[PDB]
Every structure is written in C-alpha cells, then in structure tokens.
Swiss-Prot record, chain A:
Positions bearing carbohydrate: N24, N146
EGF-like domain location: 112-150
Substitution effect: H205A: Loss of interaction with FCN2, FCN3 and MBL2
Gene transcribed to yield this protein: MASP1
Full-protein residues shown: 26 to 297 of 699
Residue segments, region Homodimerization: 1-152
Residue numbers of (3R)-3-hydroxyasparagine PTMs: N127
Outcome following mutation: Y52A: Partial loss of interaction with FCN2, FCN3 and MBL2
Residues that bind Ca(2+) 3: E203, D213, D250, S252
Region annotation (Interaction with MBL2) ranges: 1-152
The protein, known as: Mannan-binding lectin serine protease 1 heavy chain
Length: 265, 267
C-alpha cells in the first residue's frame, strides 16, 4: 500500500451512467497520501452535483472535481494531499452520458510525514521514513520520555571554606528532567552561610507552591524550601558544617536558573 | 533498518587508542543511505592517516573525516550529509596508538532515502515514483506493453471497402507508437485491382547494413508478401491485380520515427 492506480469504470472508454464506485486508501502511520491525475474527462456542471470525483477523509472533504481538462473544475496537474493516513475517493455518474465522457486516470502513493517540520524534541529531531526520533546535545542524556534532555549534575563535593554553586549551564536555560544533588561538607566546627546572587529564575506557578521546578535545602534533620520563582530566598545561616542542595527540574520550560555562594561564618 | 545511530567507542567520553570498528549498513533495493553527524571530535592528520572516520561502499570511498569541528579549515563533516550511490554503506572508525590528547569521537545518524527512479530502458510515457520502487503508465488511448515500459496501441480494427482511401501509421505524422502490430485491410469487390501510393513523410526506423531489423511494413497481396519496407524513402507505387490487400506495420520497443501515409485506389 505504498502506491496504486485508479481508473473510472470503462476507462479508457466512456464511463457508464448510474455508477458509483468508492476506493478507500489507507497507508501506515507516519505517512500521508498523495493523489494526482493523468487524464480527466467528466461532465461539467454547477458545483459538480451531477458527475464528480470526490476526494475526502473520514470527516473532511478535501476536493471535488468535474468537467473536462480541455476547456474547463478539473484537477489539472495539482496534487491532492491527505492530512493523515487515510483517503476515500468516490466517482459518481448520473443518468445520461450521451457525450461519452471518458472519465479519469489517477495515481496515488504514500508520502513520509516529516514530523520534525510538522511535545516536540527538546534538542534534536531526526526524521526517517515512517517515523522520527529525538536525540540530545553533547553532554546531555535522553530522558525516559524519549524526548527531553537531562544531565548528570550530582558528581560533586564542596569542601573548601568558600565556594560557588549554580544550576547546570547557569545562566543559560537549565536542563529539563534533571535531579541535581550539590553537597557541601566543610571541616567540623565550620558553619555554612548560604547566599543567592545574580539571576534567580526557577519556573513557578501563581497559585500553587513550586509544582514544577524547585530547590530544597537539607540541613540537619530539616528541609528548607521548596524554593522557586523570580525572587531568591533570603540568605541562610545554618549551624551546620554540611548542607545538601537538591535542584529538581521538570520536562518543560527555559528558565535561567540560579547561583549561590557559601561561606563559613 | 530504515534508520539508526552510531557512536565512537566510549562516547561521549574520549575514545580508546588502537581501536577499529566497522559498521555495515544495508537498506532494501530502491533506497539509498543518508549519513550525518551531530558531534565530531577527532585528531587531525594528513589525509586523515592517523585517526579517521571512513565512509565507503564496496568499491568506492565516499568520504574520510578527521579533526575537530571547533577548529576550522578542517576535514570534519560539519553539517554535510553523506549520500551513498546505492543501498550499501560501510563506516570505519580508526584510532591509532597515539591518543595523547583526549578526543571525544563522534555521534552519527543514518536513514534510508527513497530513490526517485523517475528523476535519477526508462518509461516510454509516464513514470511514477513511490517509496521503494517505481512504475510506468501510458497516455490515454495507449496500452502498457508486456515489458511494463513501452506504450503500444490497438491499430487493427479497420476495413477499407471504398473505391479510394487513405491509410497511415497511428498518429501520423507524429511519432508512431512503439511495440505495436497494425493490420490494415483493404477489401474490394471481385474484379477491382488495388493501386497503392505512398505520399508525404516516410520515416520508418532502419539500419544501414541489415534490411529492416527494427520496424517495417509488409504488404500481402495474393499468396505473396512485398517488403519488408523501412527507411526514409518510400517504395515506388504498387499496382496489384487484387481486390484485397493486407498491410502489416510492425514497430519495436525503441525510436521516435514519424511513420508513413498511403492512398489507395481500386481500378
Ligand atoms: C511486468 O509487471 C509485473 C507486475 O505487474 C512484473 O512482475 C513482471 O515481471 C513485469 N515484466 C517484466 C518483464 O519485468
Ligand atoms: Ca453524465
Ligand atoms: Ca517521518
Ligand atoms: Ca521546568
Ligand atoms: Ca590517535
Ligand atoms: Ca522510488
Ligand atoms: Ca522503432
């Protein structure tokens, strides 16, 4: 079902009267139908109510043709493309073909849908015949949704008296679908003070507290947050030599993220 | 296997030294292979002699890449697509013994691409392309021959009974249909004798050495066949002693010759 030919009854002779033939064309998923004509010779009438070639889908009429390609409503060299993978064609003939119209000769074929051109791929889209797939930029990992591109952002440990911690690629949009664990572990006796600076931009919601992306900060047996939005939390003075910062990002958005510096009190 | 992805060993980490991997890609008949790269980071060398990605067929090297996409004036693939001539593509990544610098290799993607045979022993009239193949069809009034390629006609449904008349090759003086077999029959009453006379253009494919090996006219009168006739020069007028004559016109699968016209008169 990648291709086919269709003719009116009797072709290349004049078609009979009182005839009605329907052809249903189905192609696999990821394909559309292309239809064109090499010969078209029908009765010409007002809005093709008498004799006609009707091209339609299951819920939509794509085209209706009648008349003669010579001096007339005809398809001409025009291609009829279906929106999806289905096309129905009906040739109808009324009660009298006294002029001996010779009908039509048509050809159809499956055409690949280019999904990349038509929940899209986060980074790269790759089209192929019958489908498509997504891939990611260097340094990113395709998520389990087969669509978004996450990163590994947990392989860290901050042990020095002062330091800087940011969302991945800050201040460029942070990676979607990621789960970053930043760990501060200073020397016993040191107490960590946290301080946000620069751009702060974490996707939020006007009514619901941080339903999408957020920072949580665990110090001792207690979690601070979640934090999101355009306004950073106020500086945080812990009484702890160790702090965990968890940054969660969902499958959507282009927010720029956050930066913090830490210092021992 | 209409598509696939290929990476260097270790990707996205630096590739190991002394490694050699070949990927053979075969697609069905009527398809070609399209190959492109999303990341390319190799050692650079003269003719890519050290580290390289070599793209080839069974008898032809299509491309050889090396170097890093960052630095320019290089032998990297860039955004360029590599297209195989046929339905086979072989790819070899080679890394020599010297990997001082830590190059991260490559990320490649390939897919089958339909050959458009109509664009790229061809259809006489219409060619129709589809995914994985193609077919021919004919103009209105013609019939696709058993070769699935040339377009013949029915040209034998005739009978000339009038005292005078005109007979021509089909569509004269436009090119006559290939692969056809026309039978023209003149039948007059007993005692009439048919004279034949060619006129206007006469153009039947011929050969300089061999008598009419391609197309020809034969004319049967009584128990005798005249001809075969072909070429650019019509036979001289033919006076039969017969009230009935058969003209056979044969055309082969090739050529665009304009044909012939004759008038007849029953004496
Ligand atoms: C003509 O077409 C048929 C299919 O319709 C094909 O199988 C057959 O082999 C073709 N003839 C030649 C000589 O290829
Ligand atoms: Ca009618
Ligand atoms: Ca596709
Ligand atoms: Ca988000
Ligand atoms: Ca090397
Ligand atoms: Ca094709
Ligand atoms: Ca010829």
């Amino acid at each position: 079902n990648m291709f086919g030919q269709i003719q009116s009854p009797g072709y290349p002779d004049s078609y009979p009267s009182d005839s009605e033939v329907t052809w249903n064309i189905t192609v696999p998923d990821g394909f559309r139908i292309k239809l064109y004509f090499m010969h078209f010779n029908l009765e010409s009438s007002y809005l093709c109510e008498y004799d006609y070639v009707k091209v339609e889908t299951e819920d939509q009429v794509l085209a209706t043709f009648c008349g003669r390609e010579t001096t007339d409503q005809t398809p001409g060299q025009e291609v009829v493309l279906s929106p999806g993978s289905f096309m129905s064609i009906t040739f109808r003939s009324d009660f009298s073909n006294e002029e001996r119209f010779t009908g039509f000769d048509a050809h159809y074929m499956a055409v690949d849908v280019d999904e990349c051109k038509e929940l899209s791929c986060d980074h790269y889209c790759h089209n192929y015949i019958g489908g498509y797939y997504c891939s990611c930029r260097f340094g990113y990992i395709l998520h389990t949704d087969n669509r978004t591109c996450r990163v590994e952002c947990s392989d860290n440990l901050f042990t020095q008296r002062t330091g800087v911690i940011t969302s991945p690629d800050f201040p460029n949009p942070y990676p979607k679908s990621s789960e970053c664990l930043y760990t501060i572990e200073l020397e016993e006796g040191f107490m960590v003070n946290l301080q946000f600076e620069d751009i702060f931009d974490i996707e939020d919601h006007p009514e619901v507290p941080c339903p999408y992306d957020y920072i949580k900060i665990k110090v001792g047996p207690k979690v601070l947050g979640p934090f999101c939005g355009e306004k950073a939390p106020e500086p945080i003075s812990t009484q702890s030599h160790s702090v965990l910062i968890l940054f969660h990002s969902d499958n959507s958005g282009e927010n720029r993220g956050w930066r913090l510096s830490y210092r021992a009190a």
